Write an enzyme that holds these catalytic residues in place. Structure first.
Site, short mmCIF file in Angstrom:
data_model
loop_
_atom_site.label_atom_id
_atom_site.label_comp_id
_atom_site.label_asym_id
_atom_site.label_seq_id
_atom_site.Cartn_x
_atom_site.Cartn_y
_atom_site.Cartn_z
N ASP A 184 -8.05 -5.14 13.62
CA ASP A 184 -7.64 -3.79 13.27
C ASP A 184 -6.90 -3.49 12.03
O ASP A 184 -5.95 -3.24 11.88
CB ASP A 184 -6.62 -3.34 14.48
N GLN A 189 0.80 -1.04 0.06
CA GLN A 189 0.11 -0.23 -0.16
C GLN A 189 0.64 1.20 -0.12
O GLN A 189 2.10 1.19 0.21
CB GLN A 189 -1.04 0.02 1.06
C1 LIG Z 1 -2.33 0.93 10.29
S1 LIG Z 1 -3.63 -0.07 11.18
C2 LIG Z 1 -4.87 1.05 11.14
C3 LIG Z 1 -4.91 2.05 12.01
C4 LIG Z 1 -5.23 1.87 13.35
N1 LIG Z 1 -4.23 1.38 14.17
C5 LIG Z 1 -4.10 -1.16 9.75
C6 LIG Z 1 -3.25 -2.28 9.48
O1 LIG Z 1 -4.14 -3.47 8.86
C7 LIG Z 1 -3.03 -4.17 8.02
N2 LIG Z 1 -3.69 -5.07 7.22
C8 LIG Z 1 -4.44 -5.07 6.23
N3 LIG Z 1 -4.79 -6.21 5.71
C9 LIG Z 1 -4.20 -7.27 6.38
C10 LIG Z 1 -4.13 -8.49 6.31
N4 LIG Z 1 -4.80 -9.22 5.45
N5 LIG Z 1 -3.58 -9.30 7.40
C11 LIG Z 1 -2.61 -8.47 8.26
N6 LIG Z 1 -2.87 -7.10 8.28
C12 LIG Z 1 -3.51 -6.38 7.34
C13 LIG Z 1 -2.22 -3.04 7.31
O2 LIG Z 1 -1.01 -3.44 6.80
C14 LIG Z 1 -2.40 -1.85 8.24
O3 LIG Z 1 -1.02 -1.75 8.83
#
Ligand SMILES: C[S@@H](CCCN)C[C@H]1O[C@@H](n2cnc3c(N)ncnc32)[C@H](O)[C@@H]1O
Ligand SMILES: C[S@@H](CCCN)C[C@H]1O[C@@H](n2cnc3c(N)ncnc32)[C@H](O)[C@@H]1O
Ligand SMILES: Cc1ccc(COc2cccc3nc(N)nc(N)c23)cc1
Lengths: 276, 273
Positions: free
Chosen positions: A160, A32
């Site tokens: 999250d 992203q």
């Molecule tokens: C930064 S966090 C949102 C801000 C609130 N603390 C959202 C995170 O979700 C992760 N994300 C998105 N899809 C996935 C999956 N499939 N698996 C794990 N993490 C994920 C992405 O890398 C962001 O860091």
């Protein structure tokens, strides 16, 4: 290619603009686009993090969503020993979870290793949790991680992140008393999506699902909520099972307390059918 | 084709809405009035701003009008005579008029061009202005309260863009005053000052009620609910709306939302104790 002194713009037919003081990071990741900047010091926001053009974290308001996700769930559980956070690469929900003395261990899996590296560098008050030896932090897809997790592993799963098979894995990996809380969605932009997800999660086999609304000012329309989902029946998540006021850290929280917990499940009349 | 909102007190920050059609844009004797149709791809519909700050949209006007009108009238044992200062759009008044107890409402707004434009471009808000139970005055609310007798109103609602002593004086013994009351995110110090100032004027209790207003900067605003008589716990309703026949007509307010709206994040809670 944001520039210092330029303005960061987020956009149907509405935009928000924040003037930039110093650019800290701005590049595509494997997964992203990641943008981190110090905002105009004449405003309140401090350092800002955006993912694909959308602000996810600021110094000024980061505590709301992290406290609400970490405490509304753990305070609804009788003894949350083992916790999973899916996403959460910045460390905020983890920092909150680790406040709870009952937590023995917390697994965190975020797909984007660069978000954790950049939060370590530019959000130390958010990301210091990630070095806790009670935490195991892993870079990977959460879809695959829950598919490979044995039945009955977690007391609490928090999602999250920014499908029917995924939610059935969440239900299966939770212990009988398990509580899940899921990704924020807006009663103003996403109401149909919330009502579907709520029906679906009950159908999947969760005994109750209640939406908790919170005041996050940097989220579009200024609120977001989480569906708080109980595996076992007869559980009322809307009144705290383990009030945070009985725990030694309550005074350190900047948003959450028992009064806000009970308040968060009261919805505007146009959305109230989500909860009843 | 974009309206841009940005106020000198919040530097380096802005919100903008795309303009489909400009309906009105002129100074007035007292303030700059802008009315536009917003993008039809978006939800806002018609938008009104005063001195460059959005005051009303078709989409969310219900929230601020219901909270102001019902938090205050539901906190009063029998509200028969009501004053609105400001509110030239008609929204508070429309909510106030739902209440069967109300015998008469005076509405005093300094700017007649606001009312005129509101009848033209916001008919579902400003229809109230023509109600036989209302009297609508063009005029300064500061002068109006100065020249109003003691013990005239049960409820005074200050819906605006010595005075407070006059508001206290014109309210009957069990009078409720409710005022528009600023963002906990952008003006928390202004809310603390106002709360203390109204209390020292001589209201016995002042409590801040928060609401979710998606077109307002950072998505929320609150109102200060003020009681002349002490012991009055405004934060629980004295005349619950659910016992009234228009309860299900409302789109935001009910008694659960009343109670909830006085629970403040820990960083703001010193406003209410
Ligand atoms: C930064 S966090 C949102 C801000 C609130 N603390 C959202 C995170 O979700 C992760 N994300 C998105 N899809 C996935 C999956 N499939 N698996 C794990 N993490 C994920 C992405 O890398 C962001 O860091
Ligand atoms: C539009 S209303 C905004 C809130 C959404 N109903 C704010 C009104 O307050 C009036 N106003 C401003 N100052 C005064 C004074 N001093 N007195 C009366 N009315 C006033 C002003 O003309 C707006 O219409
Ligand atoms: C007129 C006005 C609107 C909002 C604000 C303060 O708010 C913001 C400012 C800038 C960017 C923002 N971007 C997001 N995502 N969220 C916000 N609340 C933002 C101040 C003043």
């Amino acid at each position: 290619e944001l520039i210092s002194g330029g303005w960061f713009r987020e956009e149907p037919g509405q935009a928000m603009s924040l003037r930039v003081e110093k650019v800290l990071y701005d590049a595509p990741t494997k997964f992203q686009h990641l943008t981190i900047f110090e905002s105009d010091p004449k405003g309140p926001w401090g350092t800002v993090m955006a993912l694909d053009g959308c602000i996810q974290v600021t110094d000024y308001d980061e505590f709301v969503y992290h406290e609400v996700l970490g405490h509304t769930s753990l305070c609804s559980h009788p003894k949350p020993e083992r916790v999973l956070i899916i996403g959460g690469g910045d460390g905020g929900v983890l920092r909150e979870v680790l406040r709870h003395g009952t937590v023995e261990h917390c697994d965190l899996v975020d797909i984007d290793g660069e978000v954790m590296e950049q939060s370590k560098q530019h959000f130390p008050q958010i990301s210091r949790s990630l070095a806790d030896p009670r935490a195991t932090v892993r870079v990977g897809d959460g879809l695959a991680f829950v598919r490979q997790t044995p039945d009955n592993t977690y007391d609490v799963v928090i999602i999250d992140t920014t499908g029917e098979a995924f939610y059935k894995d969440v239900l299966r990996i939770l212990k009988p008393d398990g509580i899940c809380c899921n990704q924020g969605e807006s009663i103003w932009l996403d109401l149909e999506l919330i009502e579907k997800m709520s029906r679906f999660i009950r159908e999947t086999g969760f005994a109750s699902v209640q939406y908790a609304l919170m005041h996050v000012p940097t989220y579009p329309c200024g609120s977001i909520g989480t569906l708080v989902c109980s595996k076992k029946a007869g559980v009322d998540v809307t009144k705290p099972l383990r009030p945070v006021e009985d725990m030694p850290f309550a005074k350190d929280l900047k948003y959450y307390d028992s009064e806000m917990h009970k308040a968060s499940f009261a919805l505007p009349r146009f959305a109230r059918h989500i909860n009843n």
